[PDB]
Curated annotation (Swiss-Prot):
Protein name per its UniProtKB record: Protein-L-isoaspartate O-methyltransferase
Enzymatic reactions: [protein]-L-isoaspartate + S-adenosyl-L-methionine = [protein]-L-isoaspartate alpha-methyl ester + S-adenosyl-L-homocysteine
Name of the gene this protein is made from: pcm
GO molecular function annotation: protein-L-isoaspartate (D-aspartate) O-methyltransferase activity
Pfam family, one: PCMT
Main location: cytoplasm
Location of the active site: S62
Organism whose genome encodes this protein: Pyrococcus furiosus (strain ATCC 43587 / DSM 3638 / JCM 8422 / Vc1)
Annotated compartments: Cytoplasm
Family: Belongs to the methyltransferase superfamily. L-isoaspartyl/D-aspartyl protein methyltransferase family.
GO biological process, one term: protein modification process
Residues of the signal peptide: none
Keyword Transferase: yes
GO cellular component: cytoplasm
């Protein structure tokens, strides 16, 4: 326990020292919710290593540095209305909730993972994260519009529904690529002057499967 946390603290210090974690907000979220709380027992021993890890149903939880990079790009603030597409283990959602101090909506298409995430969240005492079973490539109309939409699965293109559901001045962070498993991390800003896109380099995420994702 405290041992796992000590290794985690070292990982957070490393991410901070190397300029990956750049804000006190993201630093605080990482320190409150260590990744070991979101993986199966057999992988907890590796939760501090900056590498992706497997989770149930053939999916994965991203490497700590990638989760940090995406949260920093999001420039999250308390009170924001955030939608995460691809709950997985629930780790990222927990982190987001610690930063925005309010209800966070996250969508997962695999029933087994919806259960897995809910259990992890409950065990960690999280209450503001709301896990919904469904096809997140269609976003989540009930609580739109969103300040930021963070997609943790790779798409073949930018899903229109996610753009429609963004507040003006908001942004969509999503991996887009012509390969199911190898993508480019895009920061899609919905500005008063139109869509502005910043490419943040190559990444490797599981595919976003759905009506507006991969078949
Ligand atoms: N259309 C989708 N909606 C919600 N979650 C999805 C979708 N496609 C893939 N995922 C999920 O993305 C998660 C990645 O963090 C995986 O657990 C995967 O099942
Ligand atoms: Na996660």
């Amino acid at each position: 326990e405290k041992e796992l946390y000590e290794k985690w603290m070292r990982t957070v210090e490393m991410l901070k020292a190397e300029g990956i974690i750049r804000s006190k907000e993201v630093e605080r979220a990482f320190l409150k919710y260590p990744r070991y709380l979101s993986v199966e027992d057999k992988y907890k021993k590796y939760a501090h290593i900056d590498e992706p890890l497997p989770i149930p149903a053939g999916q994965t939880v991203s490497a700590p540095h990638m989760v940090a990079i995406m949260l920093e790009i999001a420039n999250l603030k308390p009170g924001m209305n955030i939608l995460e597409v691809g709950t997985g283990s629930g780790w990222n959602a927990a982190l987001i909730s610690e930063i925005v101090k309010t209800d966070v909506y996250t969508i997962e298409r695999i029933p087994e993972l919806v259960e897995f995430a809910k259990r992890n969240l409950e065990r960690a005492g999280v209450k503001n994260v709301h896990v919904i079973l469904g096809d997140g490539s269609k976003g989540f109309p009930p609580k739109a519009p969103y300040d930021v939409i963070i997609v943790t699965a790779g798409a073949p293109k930018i899903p229109e529904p996610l753009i429609e559901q963004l507040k003006i001045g908001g942004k969509l962070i999503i991996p887009v690529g012509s390969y199911h498993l190898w993508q480019e991390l895009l920061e899609v800003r919905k500005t008063k002057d139109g869509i502005k896109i910043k490419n943040h380099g190559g990444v490797a995420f599981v595919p976003l499967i759905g009506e507006y994702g991969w078949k």
